Amino acid sequence: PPYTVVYFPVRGRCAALRMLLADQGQSWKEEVVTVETWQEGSLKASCLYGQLPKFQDGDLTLYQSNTILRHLGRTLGLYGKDQQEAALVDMVNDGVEDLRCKYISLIYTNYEAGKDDYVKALPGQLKPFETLLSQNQGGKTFIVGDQISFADYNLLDLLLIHEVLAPGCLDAFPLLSAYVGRLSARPKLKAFLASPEYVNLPINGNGKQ
Amino acid sequence: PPYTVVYFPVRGRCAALRMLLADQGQSWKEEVVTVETWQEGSLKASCLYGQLPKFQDGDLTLYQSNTILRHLGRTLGLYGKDQQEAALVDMVNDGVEDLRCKYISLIYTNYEAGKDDYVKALPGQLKPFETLLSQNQGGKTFIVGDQISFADYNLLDLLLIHEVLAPGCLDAFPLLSAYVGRLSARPKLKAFLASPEYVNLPINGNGKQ
Numbered sequence: 001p002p003y004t005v006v007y008f009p010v011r012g013r014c015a016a017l018r019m020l021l022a023d024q025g026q027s028w029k030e031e032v033v034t035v036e037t038w039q040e041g042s043l044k045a046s047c048l049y050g051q052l053p054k055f056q057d058g059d060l061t062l063y064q065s066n067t068i069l070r071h072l073g074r075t076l077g078l079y080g081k082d083q084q085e086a087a088l089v090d091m092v093n094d095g096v097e098d099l100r101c102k103y104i105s106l107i108y109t110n111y112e113a114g115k116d117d118y119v120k121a122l123p124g125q126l127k128p129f130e131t132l133l134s135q136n137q138g139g140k141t142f143i144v145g146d147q148i149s150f151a152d153y154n155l156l157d158l159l160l161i162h163e164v165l166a167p168g169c170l171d172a173f174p175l176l177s178a179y180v181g182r183l184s185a186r187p188k189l190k191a192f193l194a195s196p197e198y199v200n201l202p203i204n205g206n207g208k209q
Numbered sequence: 210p211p212y213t214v215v216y217f218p219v220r221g222r223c224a225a226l227r228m229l230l231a232d233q234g235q236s237w238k239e240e241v242v243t244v245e246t247w248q249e250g251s252l253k254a255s256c257l258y259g260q261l262p263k264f265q266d267g268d269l270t271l272y273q274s275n276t277i278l279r280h281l282g283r284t285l286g287l288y289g290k291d292q293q294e295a296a297l298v299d300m301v302n303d304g305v306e307d308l309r310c311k312y313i314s315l316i317y318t319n320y321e322a323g324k325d326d327y328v329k330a331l332p333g334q335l336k337p338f339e340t341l342l343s344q345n346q347g348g349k350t351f352i353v354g355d356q357i358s359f360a361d362y363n364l365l366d367l368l369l370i371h372e373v374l375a376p377g378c379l380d381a382f383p384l385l386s387a388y389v390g391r392l393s394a395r396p397k398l399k400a401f402l403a404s405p406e407y408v409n410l411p412i413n414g415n416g417k418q
């Protein structure tokens with residue numbers, strides 16, 4: 001710390017790290033970038049990959065959303081209890097990232113023509129996470145081990161955005177439905193999910209959801 | 210050894226972890242899956258995300274290529290010297306993965322019509338890595354700090370397959386050109402890149418490159 005997040009005024013790729021910082025009781029500053037200030041290209045040229053989010057932690061600056069999650073994961077102790085759990089946390093996060101990429105492609109390039117097929121294929125894409133919960137203490141704790149990890153906040157966000165795209169998509173998965181319930185109830189996280197800074201931001205940049 | 214790699218008979222997403230293992234002097238077993246054995250559905254149905262590579266380290270089974278690289282990075286000491294370097298190693302690997310996804314979409318879905326526009330935009334996509342090297346002791350060492358990391362092997366593979374797709378694409382980048390030369394020369398890695406085990410497998414599964 002202290003932290004600063006730089007991004008567009010949407011939830012998008014910053015939703016999971018904001019949930020992690022709020023639930024861990026950390027403070028941070030937000031620097032909002034409008035499409036107007038982004039279209040003038042001078043901030044875009046200073047970004048390593050010409051994209052946002054950008055993040056600061058003291059004198060360290062970082063890019064890439066999953067690198068920011070892994071960094072808070074290791075500096076705050078949200079990365080498993082050992083190397084074996086740290087590898088399982090990475091395997092869940094990479095799976096969450098693959099489906100997040102398919103969701104983003106549906107939202108930004110084919111929403112009207114491909115949402116029915118995307119929703120027809122959704123059960124198959126969520127089954128792996130229900131299976132991972134069934135293997136960890138009967139799905140009664142977290143996605144890996146018995147302590148929360150950064151992959152829990154990234155998987156929670158992906159489940160919450162899919163319920164907005166296909167209401168009831170989790171009805172067929174008992175353990176994922178119960179897991180979204182338990183984590184949404186953690187005190188600091190429940191207060192943050194009800195706040196205007198979270199509820200009043202669109203999920204995506206094109207208004208689709 | 211306690212290692213096993215399960216994959217199709219191509220270099221694909223397994224090329225960087227095989228170079229990492231060979232350069233660190235570790236042995237592993239390969240289990241090859243043919244397209245006929247994959248079409249039998251039983252092994253696909255047993256994979257967590259229905260895809261390969263699969264990897265084992267003793268009884269620990271892992272999926273996702275980047276999870277396998279981070280697990281060997283942690284167990285073999287290829288993850289930076291402190292928490293700040295470990296975050297910069299992740300930032301580099303996430304950039305490498307973003308460019309590998311664009312390369313993969315071109316190869317398997319748009320190779321004939323998108324090859325010239327893809328090669329035209331390539332320099333913009335490679336400049337970030339040239340900038341990272343210029344910031345680390347004049348590009349004379351590794352991509353991060355002064356010890357090799359798992360991201361150096363993934364970046365090296367990404368640079369070698371682009372030189373096959375667009376020969377001379379690295380001429381515009383003096384530090385990346387010298388970085389590929391210096392890394393290909395490490396004795397154990399130089400021997401692996403010249404062996405039939407590496408040279409006789411196609412880069413991708415559809416024959417394009």
Ligand SMILES: [NH3+][C@@H](CCC(=O)N[C@@H](CSCc1ccc(Br)cc1)C(=O)NCC(=O)O)C(=O)O
Pocket residue numbers: 008009010012013035044050051052053063064065066204205206303307
């Ligand atoms: N792999 C990177 C991807 C970052 C990324 O896609 N960044 C997009 C923004 S996220 C998606 C999006 C698009 C438009 C709005 Br309004 C809000 C959110 C960007 O900077 N895009 C700007 C650019 O590429 O010029 C990561 O995980 O961090």
Ligand SMILES: [NH3+][C@@H](CCC(=O)N[C@@H](CSCc1ccc(Br)cc1)C(=O)NCC(=O)O)C(=O)O
Pocket residue numbers: 098217218219221222244253259260261262272273274275413414415
């Ligand atoms: N995100 C995963 C992606 C793995 C993946 O895409 N896996 C593909 C194969 S890699 C690319 C490829 C394709 C065909 C051949 Br022949 C060789 C290599 C798969 O299992 N595909 C099988 C499936 O989806 O049924 C990772 O990083 O590990």
